[PDB]
């Protein structure tokens, strides 16, 4: 067919503001045909990591129920976003199941989030790990003992969140990085989003 429908992945990848990790932005994309070659063929995306499918056959295959997750983190922990890893961000702010069928894109945003900047938070204390793709939103005074403290912080009473000092003059690993994680299912339903067909 002459004209093929397309969905705006650009606005996802080109947005003024992103959500913090402890409240990760989740979006659903359906009923479109979006080329995937233009992504890994670019140079701005510093990290294009995924194993379940090669970049070459991204456009070859067709998928269903495309979900996108967006947030901003510190650089030195970009490794923690992978199937089956631990860490504060990998346990209390976001979870990635090992049986993951998707791909990961990460790139620097030093000149977009710098001063300095303080408005940045993430979950520090939580009861235990999270189920896959869980959204962990809450506000409670976690207690490191048995004495019950409520209302105000005190001894052994800790604030669940913490901010990030994204100074414009930081080195590698401390500059904020923007991360987009794409997930989907392999046509478990009638096809919704396929690759671009050649002519």
């Amino acid at each position: 067919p002459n004209i093929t429908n397309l969905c705006p992945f650009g606005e996802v990848f080109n947005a003024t503001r992103f959500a913090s990790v402890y409240a990760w932005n989740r979006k659903r994309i359906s009923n479109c045909v979006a080329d995937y070659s233009v992504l890994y063929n670019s140079a701005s995306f510093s990290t294009f990591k995924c194993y379940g499918v090669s970049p070459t056959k991204l456009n070859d295959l067709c998928f269903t129920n495309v979900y996108a997750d967006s947030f901003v983190i510190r650089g030195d922990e970009v490794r923690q976003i992978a199937p089956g890893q631990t860490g504060k961000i990998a346990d209390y702010n976001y979870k990635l199941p090992d049986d993951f069928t998707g791909c990961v894109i990460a790139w620097n945003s030093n000149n977009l989030d710098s001063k300095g900047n303080y408005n940045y938070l993430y979950r520090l204390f939580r009861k235990s790990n999270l189920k896959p793709f869980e959204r962990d939103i809450s506000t409670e005074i976690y207690q490191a003992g048995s004495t019950p403290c409520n209302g105000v912080e005190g001894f052994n009473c800790y604030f669940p969140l913490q901010s990030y000092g994204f100074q414009p003059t930081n080195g590698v690993g401390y500059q904020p990085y923007r991360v987009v994680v794409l997930s989907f299912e392999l046509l478990h339903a009638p096809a919704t989003v396929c690759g671009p067909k050649k002519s």
Partner: antibody, heavy 118, light 109 residues
Framework: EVQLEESGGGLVKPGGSLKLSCAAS????????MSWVRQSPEKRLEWVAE????????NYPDTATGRFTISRDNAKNTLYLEMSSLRSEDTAMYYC???????????WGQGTLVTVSA | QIVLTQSPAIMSVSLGERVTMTCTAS???????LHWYQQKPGSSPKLWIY???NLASGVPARFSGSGSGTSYSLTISSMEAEDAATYYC?????????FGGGTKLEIKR
């Protein structure tokens, strides 16, 4: 690496200006932000002034706003720092180290005695 | 900025026992930005405890501690002969960077 040789120091006059050159070699200097710290005899440490090698940016504390200047040179891998109109109270010994760069902060300088005299 | 305050000025603590040391500040700095160096007499400082929980190279897993908010705690297990050194608190969150007041750790016979 060979651990950040600093330029040799010595006694000066209250009204001169001494230059500290923390030249080194052994790791990339296009992405490693340097820093300058000083210690007076038996007194708490104090971050003098740091440089940003990513775009060679200058920012440093407000205890002395206009009398600290840093010049980086990635070509010959050298780090100039100087102060204007040094006083007799500025006697200390200086380190050049690595701040803000890759998480594993390490590699403090060998130190250099930069003291004043009268 | 935030000045780093150490509750004890000096520890004339005998050999063998196990105590704790505190770094106090006027406000919460970060979950993991602060760290501690070790300035030996007539030498340069070296970092062991980074990220407020993790340990750098060379630590025999003897030196530890935990804390968050406006006060942090660093603990030991059993004093030995090489503990006669100096420790300095740090903070990397605000524009200005400061150091801890320092503690002149010493052993008693």
């Amino acid at each position: 690496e060979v651990q950040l040789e600093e330029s040799g120091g010595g006694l000066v006059k209250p009204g001169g200006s001494l230059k500290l050159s923390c030249a080194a070699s052994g790791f990339t200097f296009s992405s490693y932000t340097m820093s300058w710290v000083r210690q007076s005899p038996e007194k708490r440490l104090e971050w003098v002034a740091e440089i940003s090698s990513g775009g060679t940016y200058t920012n440093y504390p407000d205890t002395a706003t206009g009398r600290f200047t840093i010049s980086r040179d990635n070509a010959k891998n050298t780090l100039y720092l100087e102060m204007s109109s040094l006083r007799s109270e500025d006697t200390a010994m200086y380190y050049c180290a690595n701040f803000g760069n890759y998480e594993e902060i390490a590699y403090w300088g060998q130190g250099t005695l930069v003291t004043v005299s009268a | 900025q935030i000045v780093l305050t150490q509750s004890p000025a000096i520890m004339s603590v005998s050999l063998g026992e196990r105590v704790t040391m505190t770094c106090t500040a006027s406000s919460s700095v970060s979950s993991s930005y602060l760290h501690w160096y070790q300035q030996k007499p007539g030498s340069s400082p070296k970092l062991w405890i980074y990220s407020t929980s993790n340990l750098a190279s060379g630590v025999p897993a003897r030196f530890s501690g935990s804390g968050s908010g406006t006060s942090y705690s660093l603990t030991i297990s059993s004093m030995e002969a090489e503990d006669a050194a100096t420790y300095y608190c740090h903070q990397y969150h605000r524009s200005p960077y400061t150091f801890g007041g320092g503690t002149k750790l010493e052993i008693k016979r």
